Amino acid sequence: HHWGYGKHNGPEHWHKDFPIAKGERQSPVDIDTHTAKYDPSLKPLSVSYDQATSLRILNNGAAFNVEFDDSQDKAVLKGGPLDGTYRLIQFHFHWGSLDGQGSEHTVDKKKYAAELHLVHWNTKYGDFGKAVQQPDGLAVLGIFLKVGSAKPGLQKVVDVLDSIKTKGKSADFTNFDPRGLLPESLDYWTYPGSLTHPPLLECVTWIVLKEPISVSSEQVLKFRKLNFNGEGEPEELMVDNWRPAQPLKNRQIKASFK
Ligand SMILES: [Cl-]
Ligand SMILES: [Zn+2]
């Protein structure tokens, strides 16, 4: 049937319906910190989320997305390896069934408990739909989550998961400040890649932060109570919604620090 993360429709099967799965700039990848090249010409990231307006949270069957109003430059990302302004449209996570796995990108083969993706689109293209068809259409900020101390700023998200347990459910989710999910340092690694789930379009400039944020075991546990299935169907827990690392091929990973 259609794509998913199960045994018969998981990542290893995606290439049949989405040939680009075997493309030249697929994500995620393993970040070898010793082969990454420090690029002195990379500018610091500029994150302006002071005007962000969240609208709703939804379970799309693959993860849960927190959507923002992207009709104006309210929450934007610029600087770094980017040319132009990118507007935040949504953020979501990828997590595992155990604390030892869950992230998409890995650092020197190290896996984290989860990975947060803040998706932004290049305003020059007018809308997200047009942006995904361009090589420089999206900018995704990736943040690693490790299990330890609780992250107060994430609790508002955790408490609403009860209302969107099954595929298709959505709920109002206003006044959420994404700044509460960022680590102290903004040092990063960057490389050209793709979305990590179908349609797997190669339109992403990845910006992966070096510093992970910590969340408590209890917070991550709530993530694992969501369902892949729709209401009234056999219960399938939403866990391990991550894709394994892909070959780097003809690509170089640059670092903003040394
Ligand atoms: Cl993604
Ligand atoms: Zn993602």
Curated annotation (Swiss-Prot):
Assembly behavior: Interacts with SLC4A4. Interaction with SLC4A7 regulates SLC4A7 transporter activity. Interacts with SLC26A6 isoform 4 (via C-terminus cytoplasmic domain).
Site (Fine-tunes the proton-transfer properties of H-64): 5, 60, 65
MF GO annotations: arylesterase activity; carbonate dehydratase activity; cyanamide hydratase activity; zinc ion binding
Annotated positions binding Zn(2+): 92, 94, 117
Record's miscellaneous remark: Target of drugs used in treatments against glaucoma disorder and breast cancer.
Effect annotated for changing residue 60 to T: Reduced activity
InterPro entries linked to this entry: CA_dom (IPR001148), CA_dom_sf (IPR036398), Carbonic_anhydrase_a-class (IPR023561), Carbonic_anhydrase_a-class_CS (IPR018338)
Outcome of swapping residue 115 to Q: Strongly reduced activity and sulfonamide affinity
Names of required cofactors: Zn(2+); Co(2+)
Outcome (variant: residue 60 to H): Reduced proton transfer
Consequence recorded when altering residue 117 to D/N/Q: Reduced activity
Record note on what altering residue 104 to D does: Normal CO(2) hydrase activity
Known disease link: Osteopetrosis, autosomal recessive 3: A rare genetic disease characterized by abnormally dense bone, due to defective resorption of immature bone. Osteopetrosis occurs in two forms: a severe autosomal recessive form occurring in utero, infancy, or childhood, and a benign autosomal dominant form occurring in adolescence or adulthood. Recessive osteopetrosis commonly manifests in early infancy with macrocephaly, feeding difficulties, evolving blindness and deafness, bone marrow failure, severe anemia, and hepatosplenomegaly.
Protein name: Carbonic anhydrase 2
